C-alpha cells in the first residue's frame, strides 16, 4: 500500500527515473476484521495528501441518478484537493445489499457502477487522486472495476 | 364631428402603444363585463371589457390587455407551446416514393389512407365510408419507417408536425398532455393537416397496476394521445402517422381500431428489394458497369435498409481507401463484411 | 356616421376606466372595515363603498376592489374556472342511442342513476333508497364507453361536464385539485348536472406508496375528487360517470360502492352485439349484391366496435382500390380477415375492477 | 449607463408580420407575457418564433436576439483540454484505428475527397470490447487530434431524477453540437442508457429507455442529424437496443479484441 | 454592530434600500431543536424505568 | 445583426486553483546559503527596487481620481449595496453574460471590467 | 392593530345548516368505533375535569383508519351532528394552494379559529394529501406540502392540556402516513374502522334496511350469513340496488328476488382462488 | 442522555426532518455536523421491522466513529427486536462495544412498571397490584403501562374519581386477552 498511496508522494524520484505511473489502483481484500480499514486508517495519518472516505453503502441514493452524480461529485471533490486519496470503504456493500428506498433496482446500481467505472479509468484525465477500496466480498464486485 | 372623430382616434393610439400585457378572460359578466387573469398571475374585474366586443370574446380567450389599466386592447391569436410550433416541418424534405425501394404495398396502404382522404374526399362521401383514422408503421429497425413519413411530407401539401415519443415526455404534471392537445389543437387550426409520431413506444408504453412506483405521468401523456386521436370530439381532419419498433410494447388501447386504424407491417427487404435499395443509394455515386446487384442482394440475406444503404456508403470507402475513382463490384462485395459487422475469427480449419 | 361616432366616443369613456382588483371577503371587522384575500395574493384589512348593500359581502363571497386603495367595489358571484365552462360548452356530437348497438342493457343502467332520480326523485324516496350517484364504464377499448357518453351527453336535458382526467392536470401547486373543487363548485350550483371524466385512470390510478413528488401531487388531486364524490358534504344532484378500459390499476377507494356504486360493464360485442354494430357502420355505405352479415360476425369473433366499423372502412378502401363505387361482400370478406390480422398485435384486454 | 440590463424572454408569436406593424409576444420567463415590437436597430428578419430574445425593462421591446438555452451540465460536457494521448499510444489497434479515423476524422480534416465522388462517409462508430482493450483511450486520441468540438458524454450522465431529463439533455446536446460546422460526440459506456428496450410489467426502465429513444431520433430520425459524427464505446454491447445498434445510428463496429 | 457578533446561521434585520445589516435578531431555533421536536421522543428519567 | 464572437477560447474557467497569484516569486536554486543564492536573491531584491521606485513614480503624478485606495474606493460604487447573488448561464461575449437571480429570471448583462473573467464557468 | 384571533380564517366552522343529517342511530354496528371516539372527542370535551381527577391525560387527535367505506367520514357527519362544540371540517387537499405560505397560513387559521372557539372539533378528512412520508426537497410541491405538515405538527404541539380542541384525522391509506404525526401528544388514539364482522353485517343491514319498504318475505339473514368481506359501503349499494330493481319494475316494496339479484350485482366477486389450494 | 446531560438525536430517516440534517441529504453522515456541536451526544436509531436501513445507517455511522472522527463522546445507540437478523457486519466483534438485552418483563419487573405508571392515577388505596401483574403473564412494558391507562378508562365509563382494583383487573382482560 506504501508504493501506491505513500512511496509516490514521499519520494517521486523513484518512479519517475524509473519512467513508470505508480500503481494506479489499490484494493484491500479479506475476511472482516482482518485490518483491511485499520491499514487505510495509518495510511490516512502519515499522509500529506486530503484522505476521502466513503462507504460503499453511502453510494446507494434515495433517486434515479443521484447515485452517479454523488460518485461524480466525490471525484471532482478529490480533483480539488490534489493530491488525495479516496478511500471507497466497503465497495461491495453498493451490490450485495439491496434497500427499497433505492427506487432504481440493480439497474440503478449499474449505472452508479459505470459512473465509478469512468473516474477510475475513464475519458477525463485523472489527477494525483489514488483510490483505495476495501471489501470482505471480492467475488461480488464486477471485474471491470477492480481491473 | 369628423374632426371629433379623428382626434378621439388619436387618443385611442397613445393608450393603445406597445407593450401590451397578455392575459386570458376568464368569465363575462352582465352587472357586459369580464374577468381577466394577467400574465403575471392577477385576477382583475374589468367594469368595462374595453376595445374589444363582448361578443367576440370567450372564457380563455387570449387577449392584451393595458399594462397599467388593464382593461382589453386587443385580442391576440391562440397561444400553442413553442416546442410544438417548432415540430411543424417548413423544409419539407426532398424525398420521393421512388427512393424507397420494395415497399411498394406498404406506400399505397399508406397513401390511400393519408393523402387520398385529403385530396380525393369524393370517394369516401359518394362510398358512404369513414376514412381511416391514424396509420400506424411497425417492424425490424432500418426497414424504411421513417423514410416513408419524409417521402409523405415531401410528396403532400397538408401541413405537417414531425414528432418522436420522447418529446412528449416532461417534468412538470400534464406538460405533455399539454403538448399533446396543442399539437392537434394548431393541426386542426391548419387542416387538413398530418402529424408523425416517431417512436411511438416512448409514450405508447403499456399501462401496468403497481402499489410502489410507476411512470404514471407517460401513460397521462399517452391517454391524452388516445383522447386525441379518437375521444369525446371526434378529430376527422387531421391524419396521424405513427412509427414504432415494438409494436408488442404499445399499449392496446393505442393500437385500437379507431386510433390507429392501418398497422402495416414492414419487412425485411428481399432479395429484389435489396437489389433496388442498394441502386437508389448508389445514384449519386460513380459506380463501374459491372456491379452485380443481384449478386450482392443474394450476399445480404437478413439486412435492413439501412445495412443495404451502408453497403453503398462502406463501399465508397474501399473506393477511397485504394484511391479508385469508380466502384467496382468487389468493393461492394468487400464492403458487405464490413457492414455484416462478423466478429474476426481464425476459422481457417473449417472444411 | 352618427353610430360610428358613438361607438368612438364609447371607446373614450371606457378607455378612462382602471381594472378592479378580484379578491374573496374572509371577515367583516367593523361596519365599514374589511377583511378581504386577493385571489392569488396577500390579505388586506381593506373598506367598502358606502352604496354596497354590505350584507351580501358574506364571508367567502367574490369581490372587485379598487387598485389603489383596495376598497370594496361590488360583489361578483362565484366564478366559473374557463376549464370548467370549456367542459360545460364542448360538443357532444349529436350522438344517439341509435347509433350504439349491442348495449341497450348497459343503456339502461347507465339511463337508470343520471335519468330517472332526477326527473322523477319521489319514485326512488318511496322505496326507501338514495339513487345511485356514480357510476364506472369500464371493458375493452373500443367497446363504446365514450360513444354512450356522447350519446346520453346528447339525448339528455342535463348540464353536462365534459373533461378527461389528463387536461385537468397541472403542474401549479394545488392546481390540479383546485380544478376538482370547481367543477364540483359548478354542478354544486348548476343542479341537476353530470361530470364526466374519461379515462379516469389518468388522475384515479392506485395511490403509491413510495412514488415520486409528481405521483403525489396526482394522488391529492384524486382524494381531493374522492372528498367531493363521497366526503363530508353529501352531493345532492351531482352525477359522475367514469369511464376507463384499465379498471385494475383504480385506487380501491375510487372504486368502492358510496362513489361508484355502479360497474357498468362495456364488454366486446356478442355474436348479436356485433351483427348489431355491423348495420350501424355498414348502413350508409353504397352496396349492390346481398350482404351477408352473418358470415362477417362468425369472423369478428373478439371485435370491439371500432373494429367493426374498421371493417366498413377497409371494405370501402377494397373498392377504391379497385376503383368501384359500391362494395361487395367479398370486399367485406376480405376487410374483416384483414382487420383480424392486426388484431394480433393487441395484448391483453380483459382488466376488471377489483 | 449606455448599456442598459436586458431581460431574457423567448419569442412566442409574430402577429402580422406581413404588415409594416409587426407585433411580438413574449414569454419573459416567470415575469410575465408581453406584446412588443422591435426595436429601430434590429431588423424584422432577425428574430423568429421561439427563440430567446432580450428585452428592456421599460417597454419590454426587443433588442437582440440570443442563443438558445442550454443545460450548464451539457457545456461542460465538451471537451476543452484536449487529452495526452495520440495513435502511437496505442498498439495492437492498427486496422482499428484507421477505420475509426477514416470516419470520424479524415472527413473533418479532408472533405474534399468525398463530395467530389458523391460519398456520403459514415456518421458513427461504435467501440466495443473487454474492459482494458482500448476503447476509451483510442477516443482519448481522437480527442487529442481533432480540430472540430469534441463532447464527452458518460451514459451514467444522461440518468437524471426526473422524468424526461435524459432525452432532454440528449436533445440539448445535439442542440449545442448543431451549433458547430462539424462536431464529434463521444458516448463512453453507451449501455449505462442503450439498453434494449423490454417490457417487464412494471416500469422497468421506462424512463432510461426513452433517453436511448431520444438518442436514436437525433441520430437518424425525420430530421437530419447535421454534421455530427458520433462515437460510441461499451464493453457490453451485446445488451444495446437494436435500433441502435443499426446503420444510420452506428454504422461502424470497430471491435477492440485481445491483441495478438 | 460589530463583525466578530455575526456567527453564521444567525438571525439579522437588513435596511429596506442597502439591505445593510443593522441588527442581530434573536436566534432562530437550532436545527437539531426543530429535529427533535418532529420526533418528540419522550423525555425520561431512571425513576420511569421498572426491572 | 451578427452574434458576438468571444476572444477566450473555451467556456470553463481557468484549471488553476489557489496560486501564490502575483507572489510567485521565482524557485531560486540551491537552497544553500552561498555566493550565488546571495546573489540570485540580490537580483530579486534589485528588480523590486526599480519595480517600487516606478510604481511610486506613476501614483505620485496619477490624478487623485486614479488612485490605488481611490479605483477601489470607486469599485464599491460600481458595485454598490447590496450585492445580488446569482447564477452564471451562459457566456455570451468576454464582458456580457445571461444571469439568473435566485427568482429564476434571466437577465442579458454586462460583466465589468474588475470582475475576475478566468473563474466564469456556467453554473 | 392586532385583529381579533377569530377573524383572518380562510376556512369557517359548520354553522347549524351545514350540519350533516347523519345521527348515530343511521350508524349500524360500530359500537367499539363509537366508544372509542365518544371516549377521546366529545367526553372530553364535556368531562375535562373528570379526566383530571382520574389522572388520564385526554388524547389531542384521534386518527380513524380503516378499508375505504367502514364508516370513518359518515362517524365525523354523526359526531358534527350531535356535538355542543364547534366543527371545523377540512380536507388535506384543500391546504395546497399555488401561493406559497398561504398552505401554512390556513393550517394555524383552522387552529387559531378552533383555540378561540373551544370547544371545538377539527376534522381532516384525507389527510394523506398533507401527512405522506416522503418529500422531496427539489420540488414545490414536496417543500410546500412539508411546510404544511411541519406546521400541523407545531399547531398540535403548541396546544397545552388547558386548551379544549379535538383534531380527528380520517385516512384509508395510514401505511403511507408520516410516523411524526401518529406521536404522543399530536395523534395518540388510533381508532381502526375494519370491515364488518357478520354480527356488524347485520346490524348494518337492519339499519339501512329500516329506511325502505321491505316485504315479510325477505330474511336479511340469508344475506349476512354469506362469507364475502364487504364494507357497510357495500351493503349500502346492495340495499340501495335492490330498491331500484322494485323502482324498475314499478314497486314501491323491495321484494326477496330484488336482494338476491342486487347482492349479485354489487358484490360480482370473481372466485380468485382456486379449489386445489385446500 | 437525560442523565449524563448528552444530547439525544433520533434518527429516523424521515425525509420530514431532512431540512434540520441539511440541504444535502446525499449521506447519513451529514447529521454529524449538528451532532459534534452538540457534543456529547447519544445518535439513536429503533428499528420497526429489502435490506434495513437503520441497520444500514448503523454501518456508516460506526464506520465514521471507529477511528475517522475527530471529536469525541459522540455514541451511537440501536434499538432492535431480534439479534440473529442483524447483518454480520454489526455482528463482527469490534463493531458493536456492547449488547444489552430487554427481555419481557417477569412476574417482579411488571410489579414496578405497574408501579410507576399507576403513579398517575387517583388510585384507591389498597390496590394489589401483585395480582394485576400476576394477571399479565409475558406482557411488556407499554402492554403494563396501556393497562393503566386502560384502567383509568373504566373508572371515567362508571363517572368515578378513584381508580378500583375491579377497573385494573377490566383493564388486564382487555388488554391481554381481547387485544
Ligand atoms: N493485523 C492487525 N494488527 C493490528 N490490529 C488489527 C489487525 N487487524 C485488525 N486489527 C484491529 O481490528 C480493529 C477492527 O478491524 P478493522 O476495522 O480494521 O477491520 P477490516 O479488516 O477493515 O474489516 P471489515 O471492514 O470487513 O469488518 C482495528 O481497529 C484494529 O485495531
Ligand atoms: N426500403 C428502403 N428503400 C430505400 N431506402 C431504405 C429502405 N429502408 C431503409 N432505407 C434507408 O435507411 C435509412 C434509414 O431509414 P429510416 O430512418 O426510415 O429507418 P426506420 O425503419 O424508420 O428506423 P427506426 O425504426 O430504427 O427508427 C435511410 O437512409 C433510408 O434511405
Ligand atoms: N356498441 C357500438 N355501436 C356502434 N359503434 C360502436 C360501438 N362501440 C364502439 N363503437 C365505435 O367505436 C369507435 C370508438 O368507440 P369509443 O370512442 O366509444 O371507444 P371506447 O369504448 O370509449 O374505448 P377506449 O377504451 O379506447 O376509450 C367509434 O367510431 C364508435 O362508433
Ligand atoms: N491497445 C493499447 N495500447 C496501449 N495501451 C493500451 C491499449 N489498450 C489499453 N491500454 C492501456 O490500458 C488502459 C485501459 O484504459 P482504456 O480506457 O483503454 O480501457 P477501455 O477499453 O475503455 O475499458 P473499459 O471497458 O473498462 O471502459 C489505457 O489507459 C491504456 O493505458
Ligand atoms: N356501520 C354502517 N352502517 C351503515 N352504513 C354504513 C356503515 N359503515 C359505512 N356505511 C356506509 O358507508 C357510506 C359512506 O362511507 P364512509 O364515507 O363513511 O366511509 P370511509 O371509510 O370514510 O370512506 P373512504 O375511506 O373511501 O373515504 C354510506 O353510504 C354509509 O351508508
Ligand atoms: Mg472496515
Ligand atoms: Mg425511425
Ligand atoms: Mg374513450
Ligand atoms: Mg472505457
Ligand atoms: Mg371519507
Do not use: W
Not at chain 4, 495492437?92 to 465522388?117: S, Y
Not at chain 5, 435596511?15 to 419522550?42: A, C, F, G, Q
Not at chain 6, 546573489?39 to 513614480?57: A, G
Not at chain 7, 364475502?228 to 326477496?256: F, P, T, W
Amino acid at each position: 500500500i506504501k508504493e501506491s498511496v505513500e512511496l509516490p508522494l514521499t519520494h517521486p524520484e523513484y518512479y519517475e527515473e524509473m519512467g513508470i505511473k505508480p500503481p494506479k489502483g489499490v484494493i484491500l481484500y479479506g475476511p472482516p476484521g482482518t485490518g483491511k480499514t485499520l491499514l487505510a486508517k495509518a495510511v490516512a495519518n502519515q499522509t500529506s495528501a486530503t484522505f476521502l472516505r466513503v462507504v460503499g453503502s453511502e453510494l446507494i441514493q434515495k433517486y434515479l441518478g443521484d447515485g452517479p452524480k454523488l460518485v461524480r461529485e466525490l471525484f471532482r471533490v478529490a480533483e480539488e484537493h490534489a493530491p488525495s486519496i479516496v478511500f471507497i470503504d466497503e465497495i461491495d456493500a453498493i451490490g450485495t445489499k439491496r434497500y427499497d428506498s433505492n427506487s432504481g433496482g440493480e439497474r440503478e446500481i449499474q449505472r452508479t457502477m459505470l459512473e465509478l467505472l469512468n473516474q477510475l479509468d475513464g475519458f477525463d484525465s485523472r489527477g494525483d487522486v489514488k483510490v483505495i477500496m476495501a471489501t470482505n466480498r471480492i467475488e461480488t464486485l464486477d471485474p471491470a472495476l477492480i481491473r | 364631428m369628423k374632426d371629433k372623430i379623428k382626434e378621439n382616434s388619436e387618443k385611442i393610439k397613445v393608450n393603445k402603444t406597445l407593450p401590451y400585457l397578455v392575459s386570458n378572460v376568464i368569465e363575462l359578466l352582465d352587472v357586459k363585463c369580464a374577468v381577466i387573469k394577467t400574465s403575471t398571475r392577477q385576477t382583475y374585474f374589468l367594469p368595462v371589457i374595453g376595445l374589444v366586443d363582448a361578443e367576440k370574446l370567450k372564457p380563455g380567450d387570449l387577449v392584451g390587455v393595458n399594462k397599467d389599466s388593464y382593461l382589453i386592447l386587443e385580442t391576440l391569436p391562440t397561444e400553442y407551446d413553442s416546442r410544438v410550433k417548432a415540430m411543424e416541418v417548413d423544409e419539407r424534405p426532398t424525398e420521393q416514393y421512388s427512393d424507397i425501394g420494395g415497399l411498394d404495398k406498404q406506400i399505397q396502404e399508406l397513401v390511400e389512407a393519408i393523402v387520398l382522404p385529403m385530396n380525393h374526399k369524393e370517394k369516401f362521401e359518394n362510398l358512404g365510408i369513414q376514412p381511416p383514422k391514424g396509420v400506424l408503421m411497425y417492424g425490424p429497425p432500418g426497414t424504411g419507417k421513417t423514410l416513408l413519413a419524409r417521402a409523405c411530407a415531401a410528396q403532400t401539401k397538408a401541413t405537417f408536425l414531425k414528432l418522436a415519443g420522447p418529446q412528449l415526455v416532461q417534468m412538470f404534471i400534464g406538460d405533455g398532455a399539454k403538448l399533446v392537445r396543442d399539437a392537434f389543437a394548431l393541426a386542426k387550426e391548419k387542416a387538413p393537416s398530418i402529424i408523425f409520431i416517431d417512436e411511438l413506444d416512448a409514450i405508447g408504453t403499456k399501462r401496468f397496476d403497481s402499489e410502489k412506483a410507476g411512470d404514471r405521468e407517460v401513460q397521462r401523456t399517452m391517454l391524452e394521445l388516445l383522447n386525441q386521436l379518437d375521444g369525446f370530439q371526434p378529430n376527422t381532419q387531421v391524419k396521424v402517422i405513427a412509427a414504432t419498433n415494438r409494436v408488442d410494447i404499445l399499449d392496446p388501447a393505442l393500437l385500437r381500431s379507431g386510433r390507429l386504424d392501418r398497422k402495416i407491417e414492414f419487412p425485411m427487404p428481399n432479395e429484389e428489394a435489396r437489389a433496388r435499395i442498394m441502386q437508389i443509394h448508389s445514384r449519386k455515386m460513380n459506380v463501374s458497369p459491372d456491379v452485380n446487384y443481384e449478386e450482392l442482394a443474394r450476399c445480404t440475406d437478413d439486412f435492413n435498409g439501412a445495412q443495404c444503404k451502408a453497403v453503398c456508403v462502406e463501399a465508397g470507402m474501399i473506393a477511397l481507401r485504394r484511391g479508385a475513382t469508380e466502384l467496382t463490384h468487389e468493393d461492394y462485395m468487400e464492403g458487405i463484411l464490413e457492414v455484416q459487422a462478423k466478429k474476426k475469427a481464425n476459422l481457417q480449419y473449417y472444411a | 356616421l352618427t353610430k360610428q361616432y358613438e361607438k368612438s366616443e364609447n371607446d373614450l369613456k371606457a378607455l378612462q376606466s382602471v381594472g378592479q382588483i378580484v379578491g374573496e371577503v374572509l371577515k367583516q371587522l367593523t361596519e365599514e372595515k374589511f377583511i378581504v384575500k386577493a385571489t392569488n395574493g396577500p390579505r388586506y384589512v381593506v373598506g367598502c363603498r358606502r352604496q354596497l348593500d354590505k350584507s351580501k359581502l358574506k364571508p367567502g363571497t367574490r369581490v372587485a376592489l379598487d387598485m389603489t386603495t383596495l376598497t370594496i367595489m361590488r360583489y361578483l358571484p362565484r366564478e366559473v374556472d374557463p376549464l370548467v365552462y370549456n367542459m360545460s360548452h364542448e360538443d357532444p356530437g349529436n350522438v344517439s342511442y341509435s347509433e350504439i348497438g349491442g348495449l341497450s342493457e348497459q343503456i339502461r343502467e347507465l339511463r337508470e342513476v343520471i335519468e330517472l332520480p332526477l326527473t322523477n326523485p319521489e319514485l326512488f324516496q318511496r322505496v326507501g333508497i338514495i339513487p345511485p350517484k356514480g357510476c364506472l364504464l369500464y371493458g375493452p377499448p373500443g367497446t363504446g364507453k365514450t360513444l354512450l357518453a356522447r350519446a346520453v351527453a346528447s339525448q339528455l336535458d342535463c348540464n353536462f361536464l365534459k373533461v378527461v382526467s389528463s387536461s385537468i392536470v397541472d403542474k401549479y401547486i394545488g392546481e390540479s385539485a383546485r380544478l376538482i373543487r370547481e367543477m364540483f363548485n359548478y354542478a354544486r350550483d348548476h343542479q341537476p348536472c353530470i361530470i364526466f371524466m374519461d379515462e379516469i385512470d389518468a388522475i384515479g390510478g392506485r395511490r403509491f406508496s413510495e412514488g415520486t413528488s409528481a405521483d403525489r401531487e396526482i394522488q391529492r388531486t384524486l382524494m381531493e375528487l374522492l372528498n367531493q364524490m363521497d366526503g363530508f358534504d353529501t352531493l345532492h344532484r351531482v352525477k359522475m360517470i367514469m369511464a376507463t378500459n384499465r379498471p385494475d390499476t383504480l385506487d380501491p377507494a375510487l372504486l368502492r360502492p358510496g362513489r361508484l356504486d355502479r360497474k357498468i360493464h362495456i364488454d366486446l360485442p356478442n355474436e348479436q352485439a356485433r351483427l348489431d354494430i355491423l348495420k350501424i357502420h355498414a348502413g350508409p355505405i353504397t352496396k349492390h349484391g346481398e350482404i351477408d352479415y352473418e358470415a362477417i360476425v362468425k369472423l369478428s369473433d373478439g371485435f370491439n366496435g371500432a373494429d367493426l366499423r374498421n371493417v366498413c372502412t377497409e371494405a370501402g378502401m377494397f373498392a377504391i382500390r379497385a376503383d368501384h363505387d359500391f362494395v361487395v361482400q367479398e370486399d367485406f370478406m376480405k376487410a374483416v380477415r384483414k382487420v383480424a390480422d392486426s388484431k394480433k398485435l393487441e395484448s391483453k384486454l380483459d382488466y376488471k375492477p377489483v | 449607463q449606455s448599456e442598459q440590463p436586458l431581460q431574457v424572454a423567448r419569442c412566442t408569436k409574430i402577429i402580422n408580420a406581413d404588415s409594416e406593424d409587426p407585433k411580438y409576444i413574449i414569454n419573459v420567463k416567470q415575469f410575465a407575457k408581453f406584446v412588443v415590437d422591435l426595436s429601430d436597430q434590429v431588423a424584422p428578419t432577425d428574430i423568429e418564433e421561439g427563440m430567446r430574445v432580450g428585452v428592456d425593462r421599460n417597454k419590454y421591446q426587443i433588442h437582440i436576439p440570443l442563443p438558445p438555452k442550454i443545460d450548464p451540465t451539457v457545456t461542460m460536457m465538451q471537451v476543452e483540454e484536449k487529452p495526452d494521448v495520440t495513435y502511437s499510444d496505442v498498439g495492437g489497434c492498427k486496422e482499428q484505428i484507421e477505420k475509426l479515423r477514416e470516419v470520424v476524422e479524415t472527413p473533418l480534416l479532408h472533405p474534399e475527397r468525398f463530395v467530389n465522388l458523391g460519398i456520403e462517409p459514415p456518421k458513427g462508430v461504435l467501440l466495443f470490447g473487454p474492459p482494458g482493450t482500448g476503447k476509451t483511450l483510442c477516443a482519448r486520441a481522437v480527442a487529442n487530434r481533432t480540430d472540430a468540438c469534441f463532447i464527452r458524454v458518460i451514459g451514467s450522465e444522461l440518468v437524471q431524477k426526473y422524468v424526461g431529463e435524459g432525452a432532454r439533455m440528449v436533445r440539448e446536446l445535439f442542440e449545442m453540437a448543431r451549433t458547430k460546422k462539424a462536431c464529434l460526440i463521444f458516448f463512453d459506456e453507451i449501455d449505462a442508457i442503450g439498453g434494449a428496450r423490454f417490457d417487464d410489467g412494471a416500469g422497468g426502465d421506462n424512463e432510461v429507455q426513452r433517453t436511448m429513444l431520444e438518442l436514436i431520433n437525433q441520430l437518424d430520425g425525420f430530421d437530419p442529424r447535421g454534421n455530427i459524427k458520433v462515437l460510441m464505446a461499451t464493453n457490453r454491447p451485446d445488451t444495446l437496443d437494436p435500433a441502435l445498434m443499426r446503420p444510420g445510428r452506428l454504422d461502424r463496429k470497430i471491435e477492440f479484441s485481445l491483441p495478438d | 454592530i460589530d463583525i466578530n457578533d455575526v456567527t453564521p446561521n444567525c438571525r439579522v434585520a437588513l435596511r429596506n434600500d442597502s439591505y445593510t445589516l443593522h441588527k442581530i435578531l434573536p436566534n432562530k431555533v437550532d436545527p437539531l431543536v426543530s429535529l427533535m421536536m418532529v420526533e418528540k421522543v419522550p423525555d425520561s428519567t431512571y425513576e420511569m424505568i421498572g426491572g | 445583426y451578427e452574434p458576438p464572437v468571444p476572444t477566450r477560447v473555451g467556456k470553463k474557467k481557468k484549471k488553476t486553483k489557489g496560486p501564490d497569484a502575483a507572489s510567485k516569486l521565482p524557485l531560486v536554486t540551491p537552497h544553500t546559503q552561498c555566493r550565488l543564492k546571495l546573489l540570485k536573491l540580490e537580483r530579486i531584491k534589485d528588480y523590486l527596487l526599480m519595480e517600487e521606485e516606478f510604481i511610486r513614480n506613476q501614483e505620485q503624478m496619477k490624478p487623485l481620481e486614479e488612485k490605488q485606495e481611490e479605483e477601489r474606493s470607486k469599485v464599491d460604487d460600481l458595485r454598490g449595496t447590496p450585492m445580488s447573488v446569482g447564477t452564471l448561464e451562459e457566456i455570451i461575449d468576454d464582458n456580457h453574460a445571461i444571469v439568473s437571480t435566485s427568482v429564476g429570471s434571466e437577465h442579458y448583462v454586462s460583466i465589468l471590467s474588475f470582475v475576475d473573467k478566468d473563474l466564469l464557468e456556467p453554473g | 392593530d392586532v385583529l381579533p384571533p377569530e377573524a383572518d380564517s380562510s376556512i369557517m366552522m359548520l354553522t347549524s345548516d351545514q350540519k350533516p343529517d347523519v345521527m348515530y342511530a343511521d350508524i349500524g354496528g360500530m359500537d367499539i368505533q363509537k366508544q372509542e371516539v365518544r371516549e377521546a372527542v366529545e367526553l372530553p370535551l364535556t368531562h375535562f375535569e373528570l379526566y383530571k381527577q382520574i389522572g388520564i391525560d385526554p388524547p389531542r387527535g384521534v386518527l380513524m383508519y380503516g378499508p375505504p367505506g367502514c364508516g370513518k367520514t359518515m362517524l365525523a357527519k354523526a359526531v358534527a351532528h350531535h356535538t355542543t362544540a364547534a366543527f371545523i371540517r377540512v380536507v388535506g387537499s384543500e391546504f395546497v394552494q399555488k401561493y406559497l405560505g398561504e398552505g401554512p397560513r390556513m393550517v394555524r387559521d383552522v387552529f387559531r379559529l378552533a383555540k378561540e372557539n373551544a370547544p371545538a372539533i377539527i376534522f381532516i378528512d384525507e389527510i394523506d394529501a398533507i401527512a405522506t412520508k416522503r418529500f422531496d426537497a427539489q420540488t414545490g410541491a414536496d417543500r410546500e406540502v412539508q411546510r404544511i405538515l411541519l406546521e400541523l405538527l407545531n399547531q398540535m404541539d403548541g396546544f397545552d392540556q388547558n386548551v379544549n380542541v379535538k383534531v380527528i384525522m380520517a385516512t384509508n391509506r395510514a401505511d403511507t402516513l408520516d410516523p411524526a404525526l401518529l406521536r404522543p401528544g399530536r395523534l395518540d388514539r388510533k381508532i381502526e374502522f375494519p370491515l364488518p364482522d357478520r354480527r356488524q353485517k347485520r346490524l348494518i343491514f337492519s339499519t339501512i334496511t329500516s329506511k325502505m319498504n321491505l316485504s315479510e318475505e325477505v330474511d336479511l339473514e340469508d344475506y349476512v350469513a354469506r362469507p364475502d368481506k364487504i364494507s357497510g359501503a357495500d351493503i349500502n349499494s346492495i340495499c340501495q340496488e335492490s330498491g331500484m330493481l322494485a323502482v324498475r319494475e314499478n314497486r314501491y316494496i323491495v321484494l326477496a328476488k330484488d336482494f338476491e339479484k342486487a347482492y349479485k350485482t354489487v358484490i360480482k366477486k370473481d372466485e380468485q382462488e382456486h379449489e386445489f389450494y385446500k | 442522555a437525560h442523565h449524563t446531560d448528552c444530547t439525544f438525536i433520533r434518527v429516523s430517516g424521515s425525509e420530514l426532518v431532512q431540512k434540520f440534517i441539511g440541504e444535502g441529504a446525499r449521506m447519513v453522515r451529514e447529521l454529524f455536523v449538528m451532532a459534534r456541536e452538540h457534543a456529547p451526544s447519544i445518535i439513536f436509531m429503533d428499528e420497526i421491522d429489502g435490506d434495513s436501513e437503520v441497520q444500514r445507517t448503523m454501518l456508516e455511522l460506526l464506520n465514521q466513529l471507529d477511528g475517522f472522527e475527530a471529536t469525541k463522546n459522540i455514541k451511537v445507540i440501536m434499538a432492535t427486536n431480534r439479534i440473529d437478523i442483524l447483518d454480520s457486519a454489526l455482528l463482527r466483534p469490534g463493531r458493536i462495544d456492547r449488547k444489552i438485552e430487554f427481555p419481557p418483563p417477569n412476574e417482579e419487573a411488571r410489579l414496578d412498571i405497574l408501579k410507576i405508571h399507576s403513579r398517575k392515577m387517583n388510585l384507591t388505596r389498597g390496590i394489589n397490584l401483585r395480582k394485576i401483574a400476576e394477571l399479565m403473564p409475558g406482557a411488556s412494558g407499554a402492554e403494563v403501562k396501556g393497562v393503566c391507562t386502560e384502567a383509568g378508562m373504566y373508572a371515567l365509563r362508571e363517572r368515578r374519581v378513584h381508580v378500583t382494583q375491579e377497573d385494573f383487573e377490566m383493564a388486564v382482560a382487555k388488554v391481554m386477552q381481547k387485544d
